[PDB]
Structures are given as structure tokens and as C-alpha cells.
Design a protein around this ligand. Structure first.
Ligand code: C78
Ligand code: C78
Lengths: 96, 96
């Protein structure tokens, strides 16, 4: 059962928790509060926590920037090895 | 972190696992293999395991039959107390 799926929690709690984490890339997927039906990827990086809105196309694939995936699961794993950001190199790693 | 979110697993493994469970209502949400981008709710009931396709409307709310929710989280909790089925009375309960 995935350890990164936190269901519907408030952005700030995600921040509060993640800020407590030790490694850059620790993340969780949460269900959006501001954007009902949208997922939000939260990841730790340095002093801050960043959030990426998970997009979904007309065919329903999800993606962050351009490469499409047919599941949060896939998208998550994929970025475990391909930066989630384009400025910095941030790789997802399971929270502790 | 929710114990019912299994990410993307094959329907049959869900069946295999759930069949092993002890109580009617033990369930998990899995990402659909046949319907990419769609979630599937699997629940145990008697000898069988049932699957409900999780619908999503144009506003993006999710639902199973008619009452809409803005998150799998909510939808899941709600049915912990309101049968997921209309013939039988099946309530979600966390897997073991
Ligand atoms: N997929 C992406 O997020 C890419 C591609 C599309 C747009 C933007 C890209 N993302 C980004 O540039 C970055 N993120 C963003 O632009 C994020 C994307 C996002 C938008 C809404 C969200 O709603 P929620 O918080 O209730 O769940 C969550 C995430 N935007 C963002 O944080 O805006 C500020 C913010 C502050 C307070 C409330 C909200 N909703 C949003 C990358 C990380 C640093 C900040 C910029
Ligand atoms: N939300 C629902 O599922 C309600 C409302 C809309 C349609 C049907 C309703 N569901 C149902 O009647 C019941 N379920 C159904 O009709 C389910 C709904 C569903 C459809 C596709 C799915 O794809 P996946 O397996 O790869 O994830 C998963 C679930 N249908 C179903 O099991 O069809 C048989 C089946 C067999 C083999 C492969 C597939 N995909 C489907 C309730 C439980 C007993 C069976 C009937």
C-alpha cells in the first residue's frame, strides 16, 4: 500500500510535515483542497517545500510538465529518477 | 497515510488479496489498469470481491452512484457508513 498517498490533507499540514523531513525529495501526493478533484505533489527541498499541481489531459493521462503517465503510481515512480523540477534536480524519495 | 490506497495493481491481485480477507467490506482503492486514469474500488463480500468503477463528473467530483465528493478520501470515508451497494448492505472497512 503506498506510503506516499496522504489522501486529503491541507497544504499547510503537508508543509509542516515535510519541513520536518530530512532529505530533499521526500514527498507525498495529497488530494487538492483548493482544486477539488486535482492532486498535488508536495516535495521537500532545502528550507522550502514545493508543490506541483498534477495535470491531467483530455485523455485522462496525468503529468507534470510534458511526459504523460496513466497513473499517479507511474508518474510517482518515474520521477523517482527524473527531476520533478526543471531548475533544480529534485528526485522523489519516500518520506520517513 | 492511508492504508487503503494500493496504487496501480492488477484487478486479479486485488481479488486474490481481498478474497483472503476476513470481513465483508474490507476494501482498497486501486488505479485502473483497464481504464487508465480511472480508480476502482474493490471490496470483499461473501465469496466474491466486487468492484465499483469510481466515476467522476464534469466538475471533477468523484462518486459511485449519485452523491458527489471532492476526493477519494471523502468518498471512502463516507461509505464507511453508507452501503456501497444498493442491493446488499456493504460498508467499507479497512483491510488487515
Ligand atoms: N505541474 C506544475 O505544477 C508545473 C507545471 C504547471 C504550472 C506550474 C508548474 N509548477 C511550478 O512552477 C511550481 N509550482 C506551482 O506553480 C504550484 C502549482 C500548484 C498550484 C496549485 C496548488 O493547489 P493546492 O496547494 O491547494 O494543492 C498546488 C500546486 N503553484 C503554487 O504553489 O502557487 C502558489 C500557491 C499558494 C497558495 C495556494 C495555492 N493553491 C497555490 C513548481 C514548484 C515551485 C513553484 C512553482
Ligand atoms: N460505480 C459503479 O461501479 C456502479 C455505477 C456505474 C456502473 C455500475 C455500478 N457498479 C456495479 O453495478 C457493479 N460493478 C460493476 O458494474 C463494475 C464496475 C467496474 C467497471 C470496470 C472496472 O475496470 P477494472 O476492473 O480494470 O478496474 C472496474 C469496475 N463492472 C465490472 O466489474 O464489469 C466486469 C469486469 C470484468 C473484467 C474486467 C472489467 N474491467 C470489468 C457493482 C458491484 C458488482 C458488479 C456490478
Amino acid at each position: 500500500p503506498h506510503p506516499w498517498f496522504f489522501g486529503k490533507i491541507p497544504r499547510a499540514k503537508a508543509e509542516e510535515m515535510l519541513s520536518k523531513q530530512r532529505h530533499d525529495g521526500a514527498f507525498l501526493i495529497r488530494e487538492s483542497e483548493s482544486a477539488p478533484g486535482d492532486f498535488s505533489l508536495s516535495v521537500k527541498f532545502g528550507n522550502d517545500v514545493q508543490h506541483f499541481k498534477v495535470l491531467r489531459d483530455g485523455a485522462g493521462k496525468y503529468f507534470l510538465w510534458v511526459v504523460k503517465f496513466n497513473s499517479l503510481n507511474e508518474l510517482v515512480d518515474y520521477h523517482r529518477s527524473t527531476s520533478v523540477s526543471r531548475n533544480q534536480q529534485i528526485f522523489l524519495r519516500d518520506i520517513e
